[PDB]
Design an enzyme around this catalytic site. Structure first.
Site, PDB file in Angstrom:
ATOM      1  CG  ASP A  15      14.418  47.763  -5.331  1.00 14.52           C
ATOM      2  OD1 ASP A  15      14.281  48.943  -5.718  1.00 14.52           O
ATOM      3  OD2 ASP A  15      13.999  46.782  -5.986  1.00 14.52           O
ATOM      4  CD  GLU A  36      16.482  52.426  -4.040  1.00 12.90           C
ATOM      5  OE1 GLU A  36      15.378  51.857  -4.186  1.00 12.90           O
ATOM      6  OE2 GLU A  36      17.372  52.411  -4.917  1.00 12.90           O
ATOM      7  CG  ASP A  59      23.460  52.838  -4.446  1.00  6.58           C
ATOM      8  OD1 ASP A  59      24.372  53.002  -5.282  1.00  6.58           O
ATOM      9  OD2 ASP A  59      22.316  52.439  -4.755  1.00  6.58           O
TER      10      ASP A  59
HETATM   11  N1  D5M Z   1      14.294  55.826 -13.358  1.00 11.83           N
HETATM   12  C1  D5M Z   1      15.334  55.010 -13.897  1.00 11.83           C
HETATM   13  N2  D5M Z   1      15.540  54.958 -15.229  1.00 11.83           N
HETATM   14  C2  D5M Z   1      16.762  54.476 -15.680  1.00 11.83           C
HETATM   15  N3  D5M Z   1      17.457  53.526 -14.948  1.00 11.83           N
HETATM   16  C3  D5M Z   1      17.168  53.634 -13.648  1.00 11.83           C
HETATM   17  C4  D5M Z   1      16.155  54.337 -13.071  1.00 11.83           C
HETATM   18  N4  D5M Z   1      16.180  54.209 -11.732  1.00 11.83           N
HETATM   19  C5  D5M Z   1      17.214  53.427 -11.490  1.00 11.83           C
HETATM   20  N5  D5M Z   1      17.831  53.060 -12.611  1.00 11.83           N
HETATM   21  C6  D5M Z   1      18.984  52.222 -12.750  1.00 11.83           C
HETATM   22  C7  D5M Z   1      20.206  53.074 -12.869  1.00 11.83           C
HETATM   23  C8  D5M Z   1      21.102  52.496 -11.834  1.00 11.83           C
HETATM   24  O1  D5M Z   1      22.307  52.142 -12.402  1.00 11.83           O
HETATM   25  C9  D5M Z   1      20.412  51.306 -11.280  1.00 11.83           C
HETATM   26  C10 D5M Z   1      20.550  51.291  -9.795  1.00 11.83           C
HETATM   27  O2  D5M Z   1      20.103  52.497  -9.287  1.00 11.83           O
HETATM   28  P1  D5M Z   1      20.169  52.745  -7.745  1.00 11.83           P
HETATM   29  O3  D5M Z   1      19.714  54.152  -7.446  1.00 11.83           O
HETATM   30  O4  D5M Z   1      21.596  52.568  -7.280  1.00 11.83           O
HETATM   31  O5  D5M Z   1      19.278  51.746  -7.039  1.00 11.83           O
HETATM   32  O6  D5M Z   1      19.094  51.393 -11.649  1.00 11.83           O
HETATM   33 MG    MG Z   2      17.026  51.375  -6.686  1.00 13.64          MG
END
Ligand code: D5M
Ligand code: MG
Length: 246
Positions: free
Chosen positions: A10, A40, A150
């Site tokens: 993250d 990330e 991921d």
């Molecule tokens: N910009 C945005 N809007 C909607 N929901 C979001 C956004 N970015 C990430 N996510 C949510 C959608 C994924 O299921 C979760 C993990 O994303 P991951 O990429 O695996 O860390 O976080």
């Molecule tokens: Mg993320």
């Protein structure tokens, strides 16, 4: 026995990033895995791993924005070569990082990726999975292929892709789908994203191809809240130990 961790740490969240980076390194130190697959990652974070987790050689999938990374334990994992396969239609700088190594008397091809995020990008995420699975099949039969990262997979999108090829397996499924580490992304037990509702998904997965080698254990890591009152990441880490049949 080889052990590794795949973990979306993250880096895109700026809050408590220094302290959370400390948490990740503390976690890595405890388990001392042979390999670490990260997603990330951002430049300052990378610089921090370089001096806090100095026992690992670091291979990054990019040098701007955010990117993946594969860390190799100095003295146990030897670097041979690397290859970065692009995702021509990514809109989030996503790609496929491949690193060939020697660990013991065995050759490995280590792969990681952060497939397109969110539900609306399901189509592009499926095309990226096909690329990955295809690349796993091209490796010479002499080497063991391990993919960990991921995947953002959900609602059984693996079928649309055509299913895993007959020689590739999902570590979690291979072990009989253990419940204690089923979900790697859980907003009910994780509060980093500040989400009132409860969502549970298995975004972080491990694919491998052989019956040369098999998985022995699968566990979640990074389960301890830090002083700031938040976890090192919104994702749990995934600690896997594969054994080799002799
Ligand atoms: N910009 C945005 N809007 C909607 N929901 C979001 C956004 N970015 C990430 N996510 C949510 C959608 C994924 O299921 C979760 C993990 O994303 P991951 O990429 O695996 O860390 O976080
Ligand atoms: Mg993320």
């Amino acid at each position: 026995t080889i052990s590794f961790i795949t973990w979306n740490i993250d880096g895109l969240d700026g809050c408590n990033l220094p302290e959370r980076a400390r948490g990740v390194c503390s976690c890595l130190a405890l388990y001392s895995p042979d390999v670490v697959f990260l997603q990330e990652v951002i430049p300052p974070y990378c610089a921090y791993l370089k001096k806090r987790a100095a026992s690992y050689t670091i291979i990054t999938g990019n040098e701007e924005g955010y990117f993946t990374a594969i860390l190799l334990k100095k003295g146990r994992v030897k670097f041979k070569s690397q290859e970065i396969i692009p995702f021509p239609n990514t809109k989030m700088m996503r790609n496929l990082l491949c690193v060939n190594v020697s660990l013991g008397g065995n050759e490995f091809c280590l792969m990681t990726s952060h497939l397109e995020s969110t539900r609306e990008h399901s189509a592009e995420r499926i095309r990226q999975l096909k690329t990955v699975l295809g690349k796993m099949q091209e490796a010479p039969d002499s080497t063991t292929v391990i993919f960990a990262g991921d995947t953002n997979l959900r609602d059984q999108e693996v079928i649309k892709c055509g299913g895993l090829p007959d020689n590739v397996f999902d570590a979690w499924e291979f072990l009989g789908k253990p419940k204690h580490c089923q979900y790697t992304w859980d907003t009910k037990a994780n509060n980093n994203l500040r989400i009132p509702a409860a969502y549970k998904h298995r975004f972080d997965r491990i694919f491998f191809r052989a019956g040369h080698l098999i998985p022995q254990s699968l566990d979640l890591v990074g389960l301890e809240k830090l002083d700031c009152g938040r976890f090192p990441s919104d994702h749990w880490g995934l600690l896997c130990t594969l054994n080799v049949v002799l």
